[PDB]
Amino acid sequence: TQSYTNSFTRGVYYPDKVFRSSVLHSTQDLFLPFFSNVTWFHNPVLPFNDGVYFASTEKSNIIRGWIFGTTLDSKTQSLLIVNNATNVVIKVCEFQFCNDPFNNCTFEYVSKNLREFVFKNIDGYFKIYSKHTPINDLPQGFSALEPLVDLPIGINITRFQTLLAAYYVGYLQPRTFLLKYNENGTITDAVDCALDPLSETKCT
């Protein structure tokens, strides 16, 4: 299935590590546009462009990990995030596994509910932001995505696939947002400066 669903106001991460309290900050970055449309796949591979907004709801741990990098095997290296429910191992040493998963090894980093993830590559860093939310579906509301990791792997990534539901996918775009930091650095609200003219006025 390849249905499409409204993205609502979801997929806002902390742009950087700077703390800010009770302030409205205007930042230009790869954000998921508000009220956009997102695939609801349950397709061999989806592309990457300049970042994605993987999200999921199935708690059965069936959406285990992901695969990144150009092509899939035997060239240009491929990221192999795979979870283990005790270890959260990330491998940049490709498994050379089949096209429907269930070499020069160089990186082996180790570390009811809605899971939101953002992956991006800017210049030699694979940044993963993530967030969990006890949803009472992509509910309307707001929840900022606190960063998790900033891997320094210098891969070039153009496509991606997923290990093996709730295979939500959205695509980041270069947008200007106006974020609100309430009193403790938590992004409680955001305004998309290109959605509607009212938001343009708010950002101005």
Partner 1 sequence: LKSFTVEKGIYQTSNFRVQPTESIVRFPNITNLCPFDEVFNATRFASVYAWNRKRISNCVADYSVLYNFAPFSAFKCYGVSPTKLNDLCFTNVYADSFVIRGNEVSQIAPGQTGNIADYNYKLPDDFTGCVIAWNSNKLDSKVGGNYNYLYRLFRKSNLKPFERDISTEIYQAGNKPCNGVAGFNCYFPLRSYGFRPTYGVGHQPYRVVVLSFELLHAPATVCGPKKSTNLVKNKCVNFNFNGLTGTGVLTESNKKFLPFQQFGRDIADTTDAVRDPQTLEILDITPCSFGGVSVITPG
Q: Which residues bind ligand NAG (CB under 6 A)?
A: 4, 37, 70, 84-87, 89, 156, 158, 182-184
Instruction: Give CA angle at 172 (124, 102), nearest 5°.
Output: 75
| Residue 204 beta carbon to partner 1: minimum distance, rounded to whole angstroms | 18
Pick from 88, 146, 83, 157: nearest CA to 120: 157
Rule CB under 8 A: is residue 18 a binding residue for partner 1? yes
| Residue 197 beta carbon to ligand NAG: minimum distance, rounded to whole angstroms | 22
- Of 147, 175, 202, 203, the residue at the interface with partner 1 (CB under 8 A) is 147
Residue 26 interface partner, choices ligand NAG, partner 1, none, CB cut-off 5-8 Å depending on type? none
Rule CB under 8 A: is residue 58 a binding residue for partner 1? no
Rule CB under 8 A: is residue 13 a binding residue for partner 1? no
Q: Give the number of residues in contact with partner 1, rule: CB under 8 A.
A: 21
Nearer to ligand NAG, 93 or 148 (CB): 93
Nearer to ligand NAG, 70 or 176 (CB): 70
Chain positions 182 to 201 lying near partner 1, rule: CB under 8 A, are 184-186
Paired tokens of 19: 């703390």
**Could you give the CA distance from residue 155 to residue 109 in angstroms, rounded to a whole number?**
15
Nearer to partner 1, 146 or 196 (CB): 146
Rule CB under 8 A: is residue 15 a binding residue for partner 1? no
Query: Residue 172 contacts by C-beta under 8 Å, 6 or more apart in sequence?
Result: 11, 30, 31, 32, 49, 50, 51, 52, 53, 118, 120
What amino acid is encoded at 158 in this protein? T
**Contact map string, positions 121 to 140, toward partner 1, x by CB under 8 A:** --xxx---------------
Pick from 151, 112, 110: nearest CA to 129: 151
Give Cα separations from 186 to 53, 54, 159 (angstroms): 20, 22, 32
Backbone break loci in the chain, preceding residues, C–N > 2.5 A: 42, 102, 111, 136, 164
**What sign does the CA torsion over 19, 21, 25, 29 have?**
positive
Contact residues: partner 1, CB under 8 A: 14, 16-21, 23, 106-107, 123-125, 146-147, 152-154, 184-186
